[PDB]
Structure 1
């Protein structure tokens, strides 16, 4: 029943050249990462009003025909090459959530990872421009807008851990990042399908069960409806909503790299009967990216943990999350 301490951090110095100001932001990122694991990034410079409005226009105007045409393999056997990118359909009376996922716009048929058929790389699919004017242009621009914000946040995390500010960001590149945007619609439904509600061990009704994120960090915009909870030793705590800020947390690749110094917080989504948006950007590195693990608690930083290539981590992590928490 209690509320999580989720600080609001002004991240604007991370876009600048005042090095001491950057360190003061890094200290706040460190403090939040060692407490509940969540913070809100404010003063981030992204037009989140336009994001929410264009996402709503898309979700509310797409038709069943278009959803089949864009559907991932789980919903359309014809689309064997769409495991990640495309439309994730709701199932009326059974499954409420629906979403649209897209990847690096630089993944084209020309791209070498696409020509090589490397797992987790796909070419995006888009709706018809004449039915959804300007949607693809908006979505591709948004990808690079939130890429820029994430690059800045990664400098803060690096400084927080005592590393040079490009320690993570040097692996986060426009030509090969596996980062994804997911545009999730959580609808208002009356009656709400009981099959779409899960009951937690503690009795709480949920839309999505406990999990750690498959990411380096997760950069999340949500509309102003409270839904997230974070697990602490004393139980789950509510995360207050803020539809002007981005909610940030670490994923399990950060926990691995840091020998669990920055844990990947376990969190879950409460069931709320309300029309709302959940728009995550999953900060993923490149397929071949490897960061040597270190232990910030040790003077010498020595860690015995194996370096893990990001591509293998991502492939395994996405499948495991489907197996554990269900096809979304």
Structure 2
């Protein structure tokens, strides 16, 4: 009744190199995947995802209720009015199974001019006690830059795939201003599993999270070896096989906008599965004032009707809309 999506594995290592022709061959694979289901698996990425999964688990399984309140975002703790994005997202036993921890650009400090200006979507990360979680902040901050370097390379491939120079996107992806975020999501094993946390799709599938499109330029996602994700096609939702050695990549809704929907943002959802697992997305966001001129690779002139959209405004509205539609995570 449910088929499987074709998610090809793409060796992205040439995108770190200087072999321009081998990088074009990668870009071709990115193009075909973005025109098909919208997903591919980046392999030969150079990131130690075993350590990522290990450190994330140690954190998830040792953080206490007291620590979670102390780090909670505004939605769970009224004392933290400045934490709209960064902080801990608490579970609700009996009602909400998922919980997570989100942090932003480590360069967002009290000295950063965007923090000084109080610009929306900019926040200073919060962190647990170093002695209670030794090495976690240092591991997490390094991972932000590890996956940032991978994402920069991926963006080179997407740029070439669309007929642009390889810095078309990456020039807007900078350490000093990127709004990109990491989210460490824990999906717990629960017995009994609360029914209030399980949603029933229109087609009858039991879901942990309803359909949505990523709010991002691209999404660089690691998940443990538990199949859960599905992508919508015209013939219905298709299962995305799990691969806990690589990264699941897809374009976000900002990419759809700037390419006149040539690279669509795939509609994705999360099947319910009673299994302890991890979902660790990196949302490749640009700067608050970054603006990419839309174009249409279908057209000889590449002309597009779409208005240039400032990334900051896109992000703010996108994250609020996602909360209004799919609920507070």
Shorter-normalised TM-score: what interval? over 0.9
Any unmatched runs of 5+ in structure 2?
Answer: none
Q: List per-residue Cα deviations over 1:119-172 (Å, max 9, x = no partner).
A: 000000000000000000000000000000000000000000000000000000
How far the C-alpha of 1:111 sits from its partner, in A, is 0.2
> C-alpha offsets along residues 196-230 of structure 1, whole Å, 9 cap, x if unaligned?
00000000000000001100000000000000000
Note if 1:57 corresponds to 2:63. no
Residues of 2 paired with 1:314 and 1:292: CA distance?
17
Report the equivalent of 1:316: 317
TM-score, with length taken from structure 2: 1.00
Work out the CA distance in 2 between the residues paired with 1:124 and 1:146.
17
Q: State the alpha-carbon separation in 2 of the partners of residues 276 and 167 from structure 1.
A: 36
Provide the TM-score with structure 1 as the length reference.
Answer: 1.00
2:133: which partner in 1? Answer: 132
DSSP-derived class of the 2:230 partner: strand
- 1:304, distance to aligned residue in structure 2 (A): 1.1
Root mean square deviation, CA, Å: 0.3
Summarize deviations over 1:229-271 as a string: whole Å, max 9, x none.
0000000000000000100000000000000000000010000
**Residue 148 of structure 1: SS of its match in structure 2?**
helix
CA distance in 2, matches of 1:110, 1:265: 38
Quote the residue 1:35 is aligned against.
36
CA distance in 2: counterparts of 1:103 and 1:212, whole angstroms: 20
Q: CA deviation at 1:284?
A: 0.2
Q: Deviations over 1:280-320 (max 9, x none)?
A: 00000000000000000001111111000000000000000
Equivalent residue number for residue 84 of structure 2 = 83
Q: Distance in 1 between matches of 2:69 and 2:268?
A: 31
SS of equivalent to 1:138 = helix
- Correspondence for 1:214: 215
Secondary structure (helix, strand or coil) at the match of 2:59 reads helix
- For 2:81 and 2:159, the matched residues in 1 are separated by 38
Distance (whole Å) between structure 1 residues aligned to residue 320 and residue 124 of structure 2: 19
**How many residues end up aligned between the 2 structures?**
328
Alignment partner of 2:222: what SS?
strand
Measure the CA separation in 1 of the matches of 2:259 and 2:159.
11
